[PDB]
Amino acid sequence: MFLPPPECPVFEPSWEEFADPFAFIHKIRPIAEQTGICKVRPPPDWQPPFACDVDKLHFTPRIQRLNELEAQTRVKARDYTLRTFGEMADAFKSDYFNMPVHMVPTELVEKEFWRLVSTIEEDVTVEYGADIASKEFGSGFPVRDGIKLSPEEEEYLDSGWNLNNMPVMEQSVLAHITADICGMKLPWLYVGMCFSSFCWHIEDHWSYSINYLHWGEPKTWYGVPGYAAEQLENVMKKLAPELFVSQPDLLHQLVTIMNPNTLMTHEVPVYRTNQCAGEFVITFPRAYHSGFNQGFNFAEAVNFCTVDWLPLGRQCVEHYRLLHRYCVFSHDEMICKMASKADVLDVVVASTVQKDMAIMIEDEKALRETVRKLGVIDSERMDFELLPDDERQCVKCKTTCFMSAISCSCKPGLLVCLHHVKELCSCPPYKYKLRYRYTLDDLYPMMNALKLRAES
Ligand SMILES: CC(C)c1c(-c2cnn(CCNC(=O)CCl)c2)[nH]c2c(C#N)cnn2c1=O
Ligand SMILES: [Mn+2]
Ligand SMILES: [Mn+2]
Ligand SMILES: [Zn+2]
């Protein structure tokens, strides 16, 4: 038996409220960050086109077994068209229930999902699509291409809710990152079938995410507020300890399906929703979420980072260091990139970046004093941003270095961050070298330029 979590908040903004997505998200944040996820129904005449030929859209399916607490990975031959995938998917669901696909109630599919995942006798496997846009299978929103668009497609080209606009919109600081981090910054396309499932996870760097269901049967979500993130992790550590073995790569972290009733039993707040076609789901920083598809559908989702998020992004990279997990990008490098563009930044952005930069500079001053007292005397400026990420990771904690690192002539090519000076080599301290991107004297005017831009 299954007891459905309480429903998450649903917002129905008017057009005035809906027009600017970042202003609207900021307004709902007090309510929505208490539930981790929320649903947004756009005003009734915001309806972007869905004009695809299912016979020309191709993608490589992925296979999924459905066993509660079984380890699965994040995704990185075979081929379906959207038509043949849809036909396989609909026949699977109608054969599974011996009913037409739409008369299966969502409550029932939900019940049956949690039954089949917990029964070891059942060996159900399903297939799904998950990838970024490609020439073989593009975004569900209109994009610019030199094909003629209808005036209705043109209406939605520059919408803030056209998710293709997210990796380039001013108020997502992720847009400032020059590094090509395609897996994180670009929209993902999700082609679902009944019971295809996304395991419990938070987004990289604790970013927000936003998900739009273009068409098809609904997507069922479970969400946990960011404040209960460690509570949830402790519950999963106890019940599925195999998922917490230290992982060699970011593409090797383990995730799993877990009944939300199990989390509720252990006092973790969980909320649910059925996302229907034309609706958005927003996940907030560090809000765990999982779910499954009710049947054949097509969704598009993207990460983003508001100024709200900057302190949490710093807190996240700290937490990655404690865990020895790889970063997707350097947070400090992104801060300094924005500082170098201060004259062009939005004034509220400049004020918030400035506050994060002050913490960064004080933390960095203290760390350099600590390593100097360990006998590291030699030093040389180094343009960390020119190194491929895997050439500038701390040997100990895997963090991506940018502000500074320690090298040692006895272990050429290796780096540690300033927390792990004692982990690099066994040579005497005068053979170590501090490699730094900026002097403290470079840094204070960078921050000052942000204060000027903000105070205007
Ligand atoms: C079932 C698919 C189409 C799907 C996925 C998804 C990605 N990867 N896998 C395989 C299992 N691994 C993990 O879930 C890694 Cl954490 C599923 N993610 C998501 C999200 C999210 N956020 C929302 N809708 N949505 C989907 O409908
Ligand atoms: Mn099973
Ligand atoms: Mn997600
Ligand atoms: Zn380190």
From Swiss-Prot:
Record-annotated JmjC domain positions: 155-321
List residues binding 2-oxoglutarate: Y128, S209, N211, K219
Offer one example of a GO biological process linked to this entry: positive regulation of mammary gland epithelial cell proliferation
Tell me the tissue specificity: Ubiquitously expressed, with highest levels in testis. Down-regulated in melanoma and glioblastoma. Up-regulated in breast cancer (at protein level).
Gene Ontology CC: chromatin; cytosol; nucleoplasm; nucleus
In the record, what disease is this protein associated with?
Intellectual developmental disorder, autosomal recessive 65: A disorder characterized by significantly below average general intellectual functioning associated with impairments in adaptive behavior and manifested during the developmental period. MRT65 patients have moderate to severe intellectual disability, developmental delay, and facial dysmorphism. Camptodactyly is present in some patients.
The name of this protein is Lysine-specific demethylase 5B
Q: Which organism is it from?
A: Homo sapiens (Human)
Q: Which residues of the full protein are shown?
A: 26 to 754 of 1544
